[PDB]
Amino acid sequence: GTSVKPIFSRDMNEAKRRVRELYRAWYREVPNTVHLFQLDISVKQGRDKVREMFMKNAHVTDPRVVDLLVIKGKMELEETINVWKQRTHIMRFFHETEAPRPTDFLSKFYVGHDP
Amino acid sequence: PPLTLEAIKDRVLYVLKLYDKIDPEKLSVNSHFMKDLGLDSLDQVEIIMAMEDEFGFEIPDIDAEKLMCPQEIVDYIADKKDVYE
Amino acid sequence: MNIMLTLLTNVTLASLLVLIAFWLPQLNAYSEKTSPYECGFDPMGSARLPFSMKFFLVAITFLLFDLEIALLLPLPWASQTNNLKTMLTMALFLLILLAASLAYEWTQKGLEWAE
Amino acid sequence: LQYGPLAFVLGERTTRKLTETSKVITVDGNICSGKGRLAREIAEKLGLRHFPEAGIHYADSTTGDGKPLDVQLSGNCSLEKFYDDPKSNDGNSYRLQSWLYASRLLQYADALEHLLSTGQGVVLERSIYSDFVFLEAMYRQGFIRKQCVEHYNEVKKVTACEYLPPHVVVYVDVPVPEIQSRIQKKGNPHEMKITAAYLQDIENAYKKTFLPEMSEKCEVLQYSAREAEDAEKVVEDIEYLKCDKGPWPDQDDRTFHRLRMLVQNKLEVLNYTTIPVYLPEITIGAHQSDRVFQKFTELPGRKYSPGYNEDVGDKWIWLK
Amino acid sequence: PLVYMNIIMAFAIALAGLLMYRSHLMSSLLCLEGMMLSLFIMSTLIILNTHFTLANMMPIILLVFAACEAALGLSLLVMVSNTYGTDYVQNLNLLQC
Amino acid sequence: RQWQPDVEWAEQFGGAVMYPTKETAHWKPPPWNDVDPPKDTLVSNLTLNFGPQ
Numbered sequence A: 001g002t003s004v005k006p007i008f009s010r011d012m013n014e015a016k017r018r019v020r021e022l023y024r025a026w027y028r029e030v031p032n033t034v035h036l037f038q039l040d041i042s043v044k045q046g047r048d049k050v051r052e053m054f055m056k057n058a059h060v061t062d063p064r065v066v067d068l069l070v071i072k073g074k075m076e077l078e079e080t081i082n083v084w085k086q087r088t089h090i091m092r093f094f095h096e097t098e099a100p101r102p103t104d105f106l107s108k109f110y111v112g113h114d115p
Numbered sequence B: 001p002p003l004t005l006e007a008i009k010d011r012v013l014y015v016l017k018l019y020d021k022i023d024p025e026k027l028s029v030n031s032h033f034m035k036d037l038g039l040d041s042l043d044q045v046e047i048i049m050a051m052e053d054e055f056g057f058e059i060p061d062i063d064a065e066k067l068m069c070p071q072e073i074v075d076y077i078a079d080k081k082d083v084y085e
Numbered sequence C: 001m002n003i004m005l006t007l008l009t010n011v012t013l014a015s016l017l018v019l020i021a022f023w024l025p026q027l028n029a030y031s032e033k034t035s036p037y038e039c040g041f042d043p044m045g046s047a048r049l050p051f052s053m054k055f056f057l058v059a060i061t062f063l064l065f066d067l068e069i070a071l072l073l074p075l076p077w078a079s080q081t082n083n084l085k086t087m088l089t090m091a092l093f094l095l096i097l098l099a100a101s102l103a104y105e106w107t108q109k110g111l112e113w114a115e
Numbered sequence D: 001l002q003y004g005p006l007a008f009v010l011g012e013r014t015t016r017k018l019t020e021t022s023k024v025i026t027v028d029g030n031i032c033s034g035k036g037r038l039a040r041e042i043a044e045k046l047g048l049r050h051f052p053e054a055g056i057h058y059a060d061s062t063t064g065d066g067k068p069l070d071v072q073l074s075g076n077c078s079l080e081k082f083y084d085d086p087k088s089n090d091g092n093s094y095r096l097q098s099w100l101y102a103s104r105l106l107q108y109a110d111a112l113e114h115l116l117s118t119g120q121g122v123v124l125e126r127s128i129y130s131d132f133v134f135l136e137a138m139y140r141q142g143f144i145r146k147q148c149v150e151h152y153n154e155v156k157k158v159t160a161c162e163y164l165p166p167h168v169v170v171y172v173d174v175p176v177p178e179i180q181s182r183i184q185k186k187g188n189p190h191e192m193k194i195t196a197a198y199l200q201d202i203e204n205a206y207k208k209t210f211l212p213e214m215s216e217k218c219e220v221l222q223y224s225a226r227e228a229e230d231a232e233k234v235v236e237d238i239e240y241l242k243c244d245k246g247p248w249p250d251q252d253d254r255t256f257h258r259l260r261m262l263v264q265n266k267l268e269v270l271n272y273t274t275i276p277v278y279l280p281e282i283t284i285g286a287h288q289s290d291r292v293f294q295k296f297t298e299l300p301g302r303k304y305s306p307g308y309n310e311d312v313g314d315k316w317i318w319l320k
Numbered sequence E: 001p002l003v004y005m006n007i008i009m010a011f012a013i014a015l016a017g018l019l020m021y022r023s024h025l026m027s028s029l030l031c032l033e034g035m036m037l038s039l040f041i042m043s044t045l046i047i048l049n050t051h052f053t054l055a056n057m058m059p060i061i062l063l064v065f066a067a068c069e070a071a072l073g074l075s076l077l078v079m080v081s082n083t084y085g086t087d088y089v090q091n092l093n094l095l096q097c
Numbered sequence F: 001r002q003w004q005p006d007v008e009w010a011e012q013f014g015g016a017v018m019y020p021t022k023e024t025a026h027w028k029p030p031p032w033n034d035v036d037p038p039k040d041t042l043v044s045n046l047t048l049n050f051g052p053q
């Protein structure tokens, strides 16, 4: 039948726990991340750039997808603990140099055939 | 200097309002964060963080999920490091 | 003061070489050039963490042995005395004493790298 | 005359005497799980010395004539009373465990002393490393108070720290329903007074704590109940065993010298089993201490040093 | 003479330096080691001045045991640095009682 | 029976200092084995970045 085998999160509750200790590791990670990683951004914008990515994926109802994502969350997390990534690697989360993307209909009409 | 229940009252009360989103007007002893303070349970994470670092103890997820009002959190910790006044 | 004159000249001549190798050949530093080298990547962040020895045992024995050789430096003059008989025994006695200490350390492990 | 620092200087080594079969092996199991038999068969099969499980009067077995003395003079604790009324206000539960810990502690020391002296392998039922589990089951049933657990783990950590894990540890797995059938068949009236929760508690704390941490310290052999009867099969595995996992191989003659000197001085062996922690149950009052010790004195073969008591019949005293 | 004054006040600040621990034992241990350098220079100054041929002995032999004192000294610091990790005298107080 | 010392009298000179004060009120009598237990692990092996240059 349509019933499926979960890996770690049987339902939303345990999955909601797993996204919580991601915050638990991340929140105490951002301060010394900036400290160790020679970053010039402050902790304040470091904290909420972890925030909005939770709402970047705050629509999935399938527990497996949350579980499939919880592994990657600690993967990028662990990649930051032992300085494996470089400055540009974490800067890629900080969208900083690209041109702003148009939003209103007048802007994309004035830009080109982009729908 | 042993702490008191009143001491825990002001310890929680102080660190509650350095949270930018927490509004002092909505803040009270009975402040349901998700409706009175308008804070998602995701936001609920970074309060009890400031609890465990300033109180110097550890709050499990199986306990931090229902710690909701400023009254509940006070009586939670009071049983933990054994302050009963 | 002849040794002073050559010593003064020597340290002087060295100082000119570093002097005109720091001002004449241009100056352009922009941080990442000034950064430490970690074979291309960014260091874990330290160069100050305890780099604990694994041969600490042999280091102190060097002090005892480098000290005791200073006891037998007078040997060339010690040969030209009226009492080479006790000179032979005493000077020999030192060399067996170093030999015994080396033999003692050798047998009870010692010189091999402590793990 | 026994091996001391002088013997080490003269030439009395101990890494020479030990051989491949110089293994100290402890069997383990549940309550009346038949592991005591397996200790006997493996002992006689490979020519290993068998040490029965240390009872309340095991110390009486190694002292004097080897007969069990009076309980009031050799512990003031009865396993039957522990069976009948576990929650007795006197506190026989911790008196059972603490006294039995030192009896096993004396059992373990004598086993290692024989292994280090002669080199002939020694097999004993259970050990000090398997003693904590009985108290853990007790606390998991309301049998004991938490302060007793604190005292036990304190002395166990203090006393068992400088000892080494035994060469091979073998466990027989008998389920609780099978264990209940065995004890019911036994018919000893004291062992109906048991709790099935206690029997799973002792079983759980074996496989959850004892076997796990013992695995990295020495080889673990989990054996099925039916396999245990095949005494031929259980011994081939222990014969061709790696015997490398643990602090046993990295043991020079000097550290062996420290171990032998510790075990040979019996008073030191259980010296720290009398920690001055003033537990309400563990402590015996001054008047009881004097009267009971005064009782111990005129018991035959106890007033003076061994080989010096006239009531025993030791002659040549005036020039002994 | 004035050369003598310079090198006995070398002792004094070395004396002050030794029995004044700020952070770690290594700096004080080095001060103990360097303390004998004044002791060496001190003893050496009289002995060549006074032309006493035999007693040129002791400047070298003072060096045998003063540096041997240091030899067991920094080897003792090895035992600290394994149990203690660091070499701080402020932490070096586990026998508070 | 003449009065013999009880448990409570034993605790008189039973602490770290039988004659205590606030300064030593937080002390701790030495362990009976006279060996302090090992503290937090103090291994800090540095990381070497071999390659790619």
Ligand SMILES: Nc1nc2c(ncn2[C@@H]2O[C@H](COP(=O)(O)OP(=O)(O)OP(=O)(O)O)[C@@H](O)[C@H]2O)c(=O)[nH]1
Residues within 6 Å of the ligand: D029, D030, D031, D032, D033, D034, D035, D036, D037, D053, D079, D096, D097, D100, D101, D104, D125, D131, D134, D135
């Ligand atoms: N507290 C305590 N009780 C023990 C100890 N050793 C044995 N007993 C008790 O001995 C009784 C019988 O169980 P066991 O000794 O484990 O086993 P057995 O009945 O001799 O049978 P086998 O396991 O086959 O040897 C039970 O009441 C046990 O609790 C011990 O070290 N401490």
Ligand SMILES: [Mg+2]
Residues within 6 Å of the ligand: D032, D033, D036, D053, D125
């Ligand atoms: Mg048994």
